[PDB]
Amino acid sequence: KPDETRVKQFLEGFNIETFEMVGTLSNAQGTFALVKGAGGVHRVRVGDYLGRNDGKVVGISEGKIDVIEIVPDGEGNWLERPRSLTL
């Protein structure tokens, strides 16, 4: 199930397929995917969201960000769907 409590993030105002993985960044605050989209390059960590379908960032490897989106069944349940952004 989607989390209706949380506040959607900036990058959830945009279509996921418009985004590009342009690399990865690691520093004292952890590991971030570099996601080029919505007018600049964003530092995105696991658990952050991308796109309009509750796309949770679940994997960040050199050259691919794994996302799992959650969309309704129509049937009162929810289905998980992968999205990938590759470098």
Resolution attained, angstroms: 1.7
Contact 51, 14 (CB under 8 A): yes
Separation between Cα atoms, residue 52 and residue 63, nearest integer Å: 22
∠44-19-51 over CA atoms, to 5°? 70
Q: How many Å is the Cα radius of gyration of the chain?
A: 13
Separation between Cα atoms, residue 75 and residue 53, nearest integer Å: 17
What is the domain partition of the chain in residue ranges?
1-87
Experimental method: X-ray
Residue 80 main-chain phi, psi, to 5 deg:
-100, 145
CATH of 1-87 among 3.60.15.10, 3.40.50.150, 3.30.420.10, 2.30.30.830? 2.30.30.830
